[PDB]
Paper text:
Like other zoonotic coronaviruses, SARS-CoV-2 expresses a surface spike (S) glycoprotein, which consists of S1 and S2 subunits that form a homotrimeric viral spike to interact with host cells. The interaction is mediated by the S1 receptor binding domain (RBD), which binds the peptidase domain of human angiotensin-converting enzyme 2 (hACE2) as a host receptor. VHH antibodies, or nanobodies (Nbs), are minimal, monomeric antigen binding domains derived from camelid single-chain antibodies. To produce high-quality SARS-CoV-2 neutralizing Nbs, we immunized a llama with the recombinant RBD.
Nbs 89 and 20 have affinities of 108 and 10.4 pM, respectively, and the most potent Nb21 did not show detectable dissociation from the RBD during 20 min of SPR analysis. Our analysis confirmed the presence of a dominant epitope I (e.g., epitopes of Nbs 20 and 21) overlapping with the hACE2 binding site. Most of the residues in the RBD (Asn334 to Gly526) and in the entire Nb20, particularly those at the protein interaction interface, are well resolved. There are two nearly identical copies of RBD-Nb20 complexes in one asymmetric unit, with a root mean square deviation of 0.277 Å over 287 Cα atoms. In the structure, all three CDRs of Nb20 interact with the RBD by binding to its large extended external loop with two short β strands. Glu484 of the RBD forms hydrogen bonding and ionic interactions with the side chains of Arg31 (CDR1) and Tyr104 (CDR3) of Nb20, whereas Gln493 of the RBD forms hydrogen bonds with the main-chain carbonyl of Ala29 (CDR1) and the side chain of Arg97 (CDR3) of Nb20. These interactions constitute a major polar interaction network at the RBD and Nb20 interface. Arg31 of Nb20 also engages in a cation π interaction with the side chain of Phe490 of the RBD. In addition, Met55 from the CDR2 of Nb20 packs against residues Leu452, Phe490, and Leu492 of the RBD to form hydrophobic interactions at the interface. Another small patch of hydrophobic interactions is formed among residues Val483 of the RBD and Phe45 and Leu59 from the framework β sheet of Nb20.
Residue numbers in the entry:
A (entry chain C): 1 to 117
B (entry chain A): 334 to 527
Amino acid sequence: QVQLVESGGGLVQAGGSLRLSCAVSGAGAHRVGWFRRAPGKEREFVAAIGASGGMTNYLDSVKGRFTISRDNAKNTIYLQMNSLKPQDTAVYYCAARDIETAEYIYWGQGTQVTVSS
Amino acid sequence: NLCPFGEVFNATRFASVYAWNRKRISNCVADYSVLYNSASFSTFKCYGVSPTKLNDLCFTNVYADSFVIRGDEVRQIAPGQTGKIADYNYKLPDDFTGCVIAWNSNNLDSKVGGNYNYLYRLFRKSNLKPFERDISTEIYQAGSTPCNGVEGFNCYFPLQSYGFQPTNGVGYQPYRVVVLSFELLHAPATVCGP
Ligand SMILES: C[As](C)(=O)[O-]
Ligand SMILES: C[As](C)(=O)[O-]
């Protein structure tokens, strides 16, 4: 089917950068986005990439601090994270949307990200 | 002079179905004889006009639409059709006076890894009117819950891409589709045959 594996989580001070990756089990032509688990709300949309690499979509609270891209040739998707904030401390999941139903059925375990000030 | 054959058919870059591109071909002479002879085409349909006697007939203006779809989706390019392609991407009227041309481009539009640059709409509030191009990227709310932000449950990104592999089925292989619609006003002296 379709499998996902994240990597690159950890601890970070206020500011600075993180680049999370995501490995895919041969899946192609899927829209991919990132989901983070904040203590207050949890399981919320973060970013979004097209299979072609176009049609990007992000948050407005994170508009211009995160930047998503992918390498279909290398079969992995990256999420650049800049100017972190104590709000952004969360577990970051990686998800794959099915062609028919856009519900993000295929998922991944996810990792941790902690921002202190 | 003669009407663009290469500029439209032999064009290197074709658009996507939801963003089809117009080409107004006026004030020129066009001979469809060269088109009918080539056996490269896979589907050469006409609606309200005769295929062989195209050459002798004359019109006011013509509108060429360029785009690319799946192999099974070629069936949806017709009057009174329904489906993901016809309803939300490209729709033809019932009084459609024109032609439908489509040929196989699997050799030229499929990559070893696969081509995902060709995209198609999958959702919309209401069905499209004939010849209506909607290119808005705004996310649509399937469910009752309002989604001012971006993707979630019943809040989806409108588009989707095609996996075009040269090992995929012919139904999933790509096809370059051109649709010629005709028009006739009070002044008809602009486009004519040999
Ligand atoms: C929703 As898409 C641009 O990844 O086909
Ligand atoms: C309706 As057809 C696939 O023969 O152009």
